[PDB]
From Swiss-Prot:
Similarity field: Belongs to the bacterial ribosomal protein bL33 family.
Matches recorded under NCBIfam families: PRK00595.1 (NF001860), rpmG_bact (TIGR01023)
Organism: Escherichia coli (strain K12)
Any one of the GO BP annotations: response to antibiotic
Disulfide bonds: none
GO CC list: cytoplasm; cytosol; cytosolic large ribosomal subunit
HAMAP family per the UniProt record, alphabetical: Ribosomal_bL33
Extra information: Surface exposed on the 50S subunit.
Protein name: Large ribosomal subunit protein bL33
Keywords for this protein: Methylation, Ribonucleoprotein, Ribosomal protein, RNA-binding, tRNA-binding
Gene: rpmG
Amino acid sequence: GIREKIKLVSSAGTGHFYTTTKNKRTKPEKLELKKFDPVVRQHVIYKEAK
RNA sequence: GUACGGCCGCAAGGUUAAAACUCAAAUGAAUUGACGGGGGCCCGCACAAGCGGUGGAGCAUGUGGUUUAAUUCGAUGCAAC
RNA sequence: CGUCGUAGUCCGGAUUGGAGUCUGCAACUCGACUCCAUGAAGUCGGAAUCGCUAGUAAUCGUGGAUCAGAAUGCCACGGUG
RNA sequence: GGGUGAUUAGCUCAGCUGGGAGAGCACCUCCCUACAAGGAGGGGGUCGGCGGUUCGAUCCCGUCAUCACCCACCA
RNA sequence: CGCGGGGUGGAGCAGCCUGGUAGCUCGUCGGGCUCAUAACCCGAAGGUCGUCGGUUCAAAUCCGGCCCCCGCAACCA
RNA sequence: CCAUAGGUUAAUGAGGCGAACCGGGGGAACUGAAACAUCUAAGUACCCCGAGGAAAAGAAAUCAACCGAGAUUCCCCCAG
RNA sequence: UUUUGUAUAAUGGGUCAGCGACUUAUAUUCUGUAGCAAGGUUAACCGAAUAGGGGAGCCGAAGGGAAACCGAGUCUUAACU
RNA sequence: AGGACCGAACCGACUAAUGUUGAAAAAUUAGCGGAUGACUUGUGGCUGGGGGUGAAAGGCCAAUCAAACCGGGAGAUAGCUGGUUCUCCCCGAAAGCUAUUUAGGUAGCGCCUCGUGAAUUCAUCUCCGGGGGUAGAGCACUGUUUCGGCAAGGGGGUCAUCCCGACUUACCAACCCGAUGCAAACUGCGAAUACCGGAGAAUGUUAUCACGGGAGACACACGGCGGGUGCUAACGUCCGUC
RNA sequence: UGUAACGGGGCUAAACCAUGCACCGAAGCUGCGGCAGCGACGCUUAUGCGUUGUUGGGUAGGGGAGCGUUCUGUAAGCCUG
RNA sequence: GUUUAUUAAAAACACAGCACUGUGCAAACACGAAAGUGGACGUAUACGGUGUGACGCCUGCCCGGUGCCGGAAGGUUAAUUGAUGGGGUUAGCGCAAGCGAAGCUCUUGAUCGAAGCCCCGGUAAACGGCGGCCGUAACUAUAACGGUCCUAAGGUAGCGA
RNA sequence: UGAACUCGCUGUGAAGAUGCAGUGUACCCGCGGCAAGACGGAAAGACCCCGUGAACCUUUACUAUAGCUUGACACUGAACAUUGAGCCUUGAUGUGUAGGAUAGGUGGGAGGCUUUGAAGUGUGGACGCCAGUCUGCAUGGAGCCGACCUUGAAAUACCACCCUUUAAUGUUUGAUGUUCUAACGUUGACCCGUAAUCCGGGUUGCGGACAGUGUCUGGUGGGUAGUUUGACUGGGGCGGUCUCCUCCUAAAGAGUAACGGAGGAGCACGAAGGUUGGCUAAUCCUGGUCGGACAUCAGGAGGUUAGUGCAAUGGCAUAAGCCAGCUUGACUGCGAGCGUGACGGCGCGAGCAGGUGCGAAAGCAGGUCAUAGUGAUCCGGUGGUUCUGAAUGGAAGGGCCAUCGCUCAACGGAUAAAAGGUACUCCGGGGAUAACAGGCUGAUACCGCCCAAGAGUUCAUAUCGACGGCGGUGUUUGGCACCUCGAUGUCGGCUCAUCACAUCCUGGGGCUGAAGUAGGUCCCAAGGGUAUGGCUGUUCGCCAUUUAAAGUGGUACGCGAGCUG
RNA sequence: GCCUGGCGGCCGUAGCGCGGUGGUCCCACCUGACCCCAUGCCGAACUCAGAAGUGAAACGCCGUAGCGCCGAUGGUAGUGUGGGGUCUCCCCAUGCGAGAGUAGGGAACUGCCAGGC
């Protein structure tokens, strides 16, 4: 809600970028959670946003 | 040196100019103090600047204020506590 | 000489009871001196301002007056300067 | 008549969580000095009428009395 | 009609919005300068923050009630 | 100065009028979009000019698609 | 005629007479009906102008999927289902 | 002499009367306003529509003007007011639930019917049963409130900050408890009826389903009962049910 | 406006009431004369009949018939000076 | 004097007078597709315009807004020009999809560059506008005076229901 | 000019009846006069509302443009300076600075060069911070240098090489400023047309590279054009309302009304999410130094009363409330499937393929206790992609799959997107919508009674009267919409009626707080009679005064085919 | 037959209070712990090695009704369907109908299994 979008990059080759809207108004720390992508199907590591 | 009309003037104003009401002055010449917020001569540490301060703490002793049944009068900077 | 600090202190002992000591109708209230105990304030201090020129300022003891019984106030004395 | 306020000393007006009356001026007395002015002490209270409550109404409720103000035909 | 503000030790307003929290210039009394009051510099005392509550860990502010004020204003059968 | 503007004359053409279509210039509004401004209505209505039996178009700087067609125009399809 | 509603003063009617409104195209589709039937049809053209000639075109018997592609199946999909 | 006063010609309208199917789409009378002037008048010319002309009125421009007169576009446009013409039979509606750039426009669903097919179709009643949460009832619980009991808290009054503060009061008043209660937004609880399903007894000039053609319909009136609403007024307004 | 608030006349039980019995009163109930239409049962037909039941107020709308008239044909006809 | 021909006859409009201002002449200005006219056969005591209204008293403030007069440093900024980056093609590289120079070529838009705009003084006989609250003087009262909030100014003079 | 044979009244009444109900009354008809009625006659009515009407008018509504104006460009040339930018030809810049020492900078560093040349003191020209450089005579005639020591970022044979500022010569260019002139002008003259009131050509004078104009472009632009100002507002309006969400109204079957009742939502949390096992409030009492004041850890009472991201509501330990460990299931494709609405739309989920997490395991995990936190279509750009890509090889382009973006919130998006004036008003609807006579109603007003604390000497009621109760008239003013806007004309002035009686006067009775006189009051009675001025439009009201008395209400608040304005 | 435990089926007539009784099988307390497991400290909690001591407490069994709980019968509120009466209420005919209260009940029911005496 009215918050800045930034997409996470994959540490490897991936066709998707997970879109984060993470609040950075009290937490400057990075978000790293792992997500599923239907191509390699062995989970993707997503990094560097907000 | 003035209200309302004359007379002049663009106008102001000039010209003509008092009364009612009312009070101890109004006015010209000189003089003793006081005194600068004048200018000069003198002076006090006033100035210059030195060594020491008060007010706060504790204690003691006076003066005022205020209340109540008493909580005294005078001093009025220096020239009173 | 011994001893001690930036600590409201070794200190101070201002305050509060209990004991007494003195003088005196009488010290409860308003007096002084003492002891076992307890125990607070003071580490410059308001706007702003005070005072004299050397034994003067600054500073520590001694004495007297008043007085039955107490001053730190009153009048004097000398030391350091 | 209605509405909004005021209604405390003669003339003008502050109060107080209901404990109790007050100042200026006047009518007086003393202090400061002959007075102004000032300080202090007094003289006089329907705190408007009548009900509700209370042991008590400046600080409450109703109903009135009076004053300043407002209401209103024509639209 | 309908709309927008103000109410803060005694006076008149900052403060509020942005939460870690009660004020300024005067006023009153008492000082400092003085022979003295002003001008001026200091010291001191006192807020139902209109006021009853709500809400919160927490305010005068958030916020409803009960009152007091102003400004725009009555520009429609 | 020769010339030429100006002036004179002759020969021929143009002018003006006409029904509709047509070529060049100028060119709406209402209407539909369920509003309304792009779009539509519509280069239509109407006005100016010119011209022909028609105007226009024309004998590929055409297309087409590596395979081919072979000036133009009008009608039917392509295709709602 | 007109509205929930009309004795209604609510609009229309002097009277006769004459007049006074669905006509008409194309494209499409359903419904009815009829020929023909997995078939049914020609446009412009021109003609023995309702016949006949003219198959370019049109609809129907195949669908599924952006599309490539596949087909009584297809797309979706990891996949029979 | 005269942007003076009188006043006929001429020019012009302050009042009263006449006239507006009047003689007339501006003329008439009786008292008049002006009358060598910024006068008035005979005659011709020049100025044209979103433009003229105007000591400048949406005045004047030939009866006409917030764009005149004539023609063309034109048979403008009108969710609106309206005009539509002999005899007859069968079946027979709707005014509810929604949306809109939406309000007398339009639209989905809803009942009626024509076609063809199926059907003891479909409903009444009984038996069996589910959601119930109204009518009503109750008061622990949520809100709320009358009268009392015990007793904090707050205002008022006094002393304090030592006791982990008491004392008091012609105010206000919580937590809890007893008596008594009200309730749509409370529940210790809780119908008659209604609805719909399961099954069955009884029955019919057909009750209905499904697919394909046409639809039609929401401006509603009056009044109880159940309630809001107004004044438990209205020939007043919103909604269930008849 | 004029009685006008028994509908009028007129009222004394012609008002009101209990219980009972009779009466008037429509297209309802009972009948007579008709038009169209229909279920059951039984027989019969390229469709009716009997026995026995039984329906017809209707706007919106849906469906399905009848009469008249213009014109052309029917019409070189038929009717007729 | 002028007027809404038929509801207004006037205080309106005009007008003597006035301020402010534009205009140096091929004037400014007006007509208007643009010439040629009109201004004017005039030339700064000549011509244009606005408003107010002859004659006598005279005629204040606010430059915040908006316009006009004047000013140019600093910043925003167009046409123009076409830096750098992406693509095609071409030389290049390799076993390949693909990568990859100049020039050609499409694209992106670096830099260049003015006025207005952001600016600042003058101008209100330029348009336009020109305040509340409270205290305070020998009963009551009022407030010349002051306190305060506040603005671009707080509306002077005169006149005043 | 429906027909008519058309009487008055009371009531009913689409609520103002000749025609309905009830009832009363009346010889018929010309003729001259008078004039209530036909909601009389003339008018597609003024005012109000409505209409996805109409014109004209305005501009902090929307958009554009002629014109004016900025710059770029050209028609448009010459020269120089002023300053650059561009630029030729020949030469030249160079020291900062320490000791010797003028080292420009910089890369290289024992090999390398001159005979048309240097040497040395003499003259002389030039650049010069005087260290030296450089031509060239007097003049002769191939050398000469460096290493180590040494300054300094850094050497000094020798070579590649870069730049400063500028004169003179050559010169591109946009401006500034003069000058010149062929362009251009003449708004001068002269010559001729013409012994022409147009201006054509020519020659001269004087200006002079501009005016003017078209393409690009910035600015401004009502002069000119085109357009709107949403829907509801129990007539119009100010304020409110428009999407989502709970409890209730809402009818013991469901959606649900009225500007109905109590409130909220446009977000929050990567943690406040997933999961294993646990845990259990709150509040109050007791007691414990530094302790104003709630402070600790333990005990007791006690509990669907704590808490739940936020609102209202329902629930609560099988905890959905909080505590420790570990974690991504805030998953991708689907799905036994099941709901709700007329539709678009929108809620739940067992399970499986792939992968994941917690757990011993069962089991659970694609977000949160839960109901709200919303925004399609079309489109400007963007990664993946042979799916496709108009002659085909590429690209660009079209699509798919990832994707960024509206407060379009008037929320289901008529459009990214729009406000005002009209008494010049016009046109069509509407009484289906307003004030107005009537009706309904009687809240309001006016008025009667019941009750009667108190007033009034005593004393309720002579004359008054509280707090309240029960009614009346239509009688003021409110409420309705039932008749009108397809004409039913308003205020004051005035000639003129008539009915009612809550009676002003007389006529009659009763009481008194009535001795007499004179007033106050009540019920009983309707016959006549019931006044004049100032200011003002005045009704009215105030002011000034009469009379035996100068009353009140009803009649479309009687009285414009009655007059006045 | 009775007892103690469990799986339960059931969870307001097994509940609240009041008075007795039991260690045998069982259980609770309890013995011990740096051993498995554990305290964000503590063997409290939960373990692990168990019987020395009890029945304190908790637990089971049993009595006792003042009550939660169970609760007739009748009536009342309420009402479907017809109708009466100047009528948002009253009255009736016919068909239904609570909650609360009263009489009264009541200190749990029941199937399977192991062990005990």
